[PDB]
Design a protein around this nucleic acid. Structure first.
Lengths: 201, 83, 82, 89
RNA sequence: UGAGAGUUUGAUCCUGGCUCAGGACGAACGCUGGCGGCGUGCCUAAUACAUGCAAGUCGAACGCUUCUUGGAAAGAGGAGUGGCGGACGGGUGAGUAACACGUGGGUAACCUACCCAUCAGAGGGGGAUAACACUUGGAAACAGGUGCUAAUACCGCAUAACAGUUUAUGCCGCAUGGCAUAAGAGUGAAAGGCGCUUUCGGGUGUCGCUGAUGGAUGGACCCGCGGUGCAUUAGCUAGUUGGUGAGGUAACGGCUCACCAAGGCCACGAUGCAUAGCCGACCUGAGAGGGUGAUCGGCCACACUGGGACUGAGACACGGCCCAGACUCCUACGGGAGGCAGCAGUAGGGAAUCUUCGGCAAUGGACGAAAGUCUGACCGAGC
RNA sequence: CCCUGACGGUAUCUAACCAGAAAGCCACGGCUAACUACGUGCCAGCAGCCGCGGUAAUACGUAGGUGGCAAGCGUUGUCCGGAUUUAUUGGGCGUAAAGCGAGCGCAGGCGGUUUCUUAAGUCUGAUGUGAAAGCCCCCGGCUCAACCGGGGAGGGUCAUUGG
């Protein structure tokens, strides 16, 4: 499964945008349902760690088993911290590479582009979105049929291109220069609440 | 004969049988859960060509081959006699 | 039996048993025939010693006693007469 | 009847083989004496790795290859060396 | 890499139990289900088993017989004597608290078909038998009698001691003793087939045959230490513990005998009773630990229940023999036949567990000189 | 030189067509994330532990909404953790559970100061061995991952020999 629901209730429940600052929390910044505008008392310190974890899980649209295995894998580095290495491994998945490069507006669109077989790493096609893109691998746009309507238009309007992403808008090749850093990556949510959430799992 | 057998040490304990003596070899070994060292004993039978050695002697023995239902050792030498 | 090859082994081994027992009894009586004449103190005492030795030796080439049994036997008989 | 034979180590339809010296009564994937090289039927010019200083020692003690092991031991020039050590002295 | 919470009171602190938040599984069952990849699937009755298949092969060891092309040579069938294989591979965990297993050693007390190396032989004779032909008793399964025949089938005679044993010599070892060299006494084997050269040529290639020695591989025995409950289980032993000799085994040994003695084991747990195949490993834990021994590999034990031997290098034998027992089946009543804990499958027990499939193309195994024949191992397919 | 595929016209690759065939289970009083209506009235029912239900029940049964997971989701059974609740690591005995009514003593456990020696415990070096597959570390192949392969470490209370 992935998810198909209204995708905007989700942001109103975390209190974070999740869609490139394009405002879902413009009107009614409160939660969904009857008891939306009428908030109530405090939230535990279990609700806080759960809310941080859900923020990160819904950012990149993955499921709970895969999230937890990625977290367990990031723990075997021991070079740096354990939340930084996590949120950095999270960025190296082929879906974020298409999002950051700029071939798609959303992450759902980028996911459908990499699922339906329209992109290639090093020339060879790769079809599965949880792929692990390493540093220095020019991912391309299937030079067979790169004349599609939405890819073309979403290359023009560059809302955000980062300081670790390289790209050329003629051959349509991009790559990571090097690994990013927390200052360059959502210094807003957390990586410590999420680490504590998995201590008693 | 470049391969070698086992020799031991002990004090003779019984000398009633003809040509056979029981030797007790004693050692200390530890406890598996707790730490301290307990003492441990096992008795061996050894062969005597002429019924020589007596109780309290401190002997050495050596491993041979089956010489009876129970005896597997022979008498090497007497180190220190009792009086 | 069920398998065709198991039916042949039955008669083959029956026949082998027959002749094996015949020849073992031959050897045993040769030896005993020497013993009953050394226990009497009789003339014609080295010839049947020779015959018993030959009997044992021939039984060992017919696959009836191993080979160490034959050495043992010849030793025992040798210590009795020669 | 010591042998030099192949031993299957793939998954289901991607086989791999270890070259091994075993008593002939043993099961194909059961006990063996030691391992002597490797062999890969995929990988279009098939891959052989082997020590070839234990193959020459087992061969001179009466071990015997299977049919495929002999083919891949002659493609390596091990049977010629056996030839030149035995019937030449 | 060591997180805690609720609950005894009118309120409290301490003590204390009970409960919950994490993992995992050969799992079962309720509601509900789109696919691919890799794995897994009788834990219970070691309950009883319809039906098919799971071990044969060799005509280049040997005589016969039936065909297709009266003397013809090939091709394809049939049973028989003889060799080798059937002790592997495959199944299960009932027994077992012990050298059964794990780890570390010993054998100067040991055996070993096929395979590799070395040395030496391979001479000359004899008497049979199945098949076949005729014939008797048989409900059958099957049994007998007469006559002829072959061999790498069988048996004696020769020749061979390098094997064992005894004596002298030299060196040596951990008691018993080990190695090498010299002699002396009695003794022990063997088989051909297919080719090449074929002037009688009498030579020779190859595969087999006999004796002795090494290697390799496989097995056997002995020992130290280690892994379970009960003391509301303290005494146990009479071939029992030791000696002398005799027999016996591959082999040492109360292994088994006759005699002599009165020993052996136990609080450092003997004996008895209950439960259990053991290990690599697997789950959980910060660790120390605790709980399991399913898939896969190693060792052990069993084969309808209980005794025994035979053949063989190797079995006291998983689709072998003989006897007893319970059960099932066919019979002309005199008698006969059988053993899924091999793969499928069935009835039954249970909360519960699959197809009566395809192929030897690949890897391994048996026989054969080889083509090949066999292989429910195994490689694939199905639920 | 020449000769052989059960799987099987299987995996796979190319072309056209269509958003059309493909989402459910548990929970929402406190532990523990997620609340309002109506029905019923110590009944019908619920519960892992506290405990709910007698007219305005966020605790029963429905509807709307919300939370957790998702081709699965819950329930029962079995084991380790939380449990320092058998405590070597790592607890206690005046009144909470817990000093025998007191002595005498065989076996055992533990023992003052010091010189020389020994090497049983203790410490340490070298050699052999602790199979393969597993857990772990590096590297590599299946579009990724499960999975598959190559090279290592680890694991003894082990043995032998020297300090």
């Amino acid at each position: 499964s992935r998810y198909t629901g209204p995708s905007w209730k989700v942001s109103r429940r975390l209190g974070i945008s999740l869609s490139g600052t394009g405002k879902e929390l413009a009107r009614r910044p409160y939660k969904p349902g009857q008891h939306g505008p009428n908030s109530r008392g405090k939230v535990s310190e279990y609700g806080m760690q759960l809310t941080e974890k859900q923020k990160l899980r819904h950012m990149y649209g993955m499921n709970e088993r895969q999230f937890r295995t990625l977290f367990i894998k990031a723990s075997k580095i021991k070079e740096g911290k354990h939340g930084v290495n996590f949120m950095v491994l999270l960025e190296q998945r082929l879906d974020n590479v298409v999002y950051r490069l700029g071939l798609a507006t959303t992450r759902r669109q980028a996911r459908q582009l990499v699922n339906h077989g329209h992109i290639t790493v090093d020339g060879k096609r790769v079809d599965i979105p949880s792929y692990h893109v390493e540093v220095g691998q020019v991912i391309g746009v299937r030079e067979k049929s790169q004349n599609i309507s939405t890819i073309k238009e979403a290359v023009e309007a560059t809302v955000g291109r980062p300081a670790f992403v390289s790209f050329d808008t003629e051959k349509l090749e991009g790559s990571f220069t090097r690994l990013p850093e927390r200052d360059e990556l959502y210094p807003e949510i957390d990586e410590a609440l999420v680490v504590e959430y998995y201590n008693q799992k | 004969e470049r391969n070698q057998r086992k020799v031991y040490q002990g004090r003779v304990v019984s000398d009633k049988m003809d040509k056979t003596i029981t030797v007790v070899v004693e050692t200390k070994k530890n406890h598996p859960i707790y730490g301290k060292r307990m003492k441990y004993s096992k008795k061996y039978k050894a062969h005597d060509e002429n019924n020589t050695a007596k109780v309290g002697d401190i002997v050495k023995i050596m491993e041979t081959r089956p010489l009876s239902a129970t005896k597997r050792f022979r008498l090497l030498e007497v180190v220190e006699e009792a009086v | 039996p069920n398998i065709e090859s198991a039916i042949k082994r039955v008669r083959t081994s029956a026949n082998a048993n027959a002749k094996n027992s015949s020849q073992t009894n031959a050897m045993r009586t040769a030896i005993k025939k020497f013993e009953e004449a050394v226990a009497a103190g009789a003339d014609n005492v080295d010839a049947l010693y020779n015959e018993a030795v030959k009997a044992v030796d021939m039984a060992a080439t017919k696959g009836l006693i191993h080979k160490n049994k034959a050495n043992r036997d010849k030793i025992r008989l040798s210590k009795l007469a020669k | 009847a010591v042998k030099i034979r192949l031993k299957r180590m793939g998954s289901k339809k991607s086989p791999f083989y270890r070259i091994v010296v075993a008593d002939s009564r043993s099961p194909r994937d059961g006990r063996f004496i030691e391992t002597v090289g490797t062999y890969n039927p995929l990988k279009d010019p098939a891959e052989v790795v082997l020590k070839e200083d234990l193959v020459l020692d087992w061969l001179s003690k009466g071990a015997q290859p299977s049919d495929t092991v002999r083919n891949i031991l002659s493609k390596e020039g091990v049977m010629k060396k056996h030839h030149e050590a035995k019937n030449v002295k």
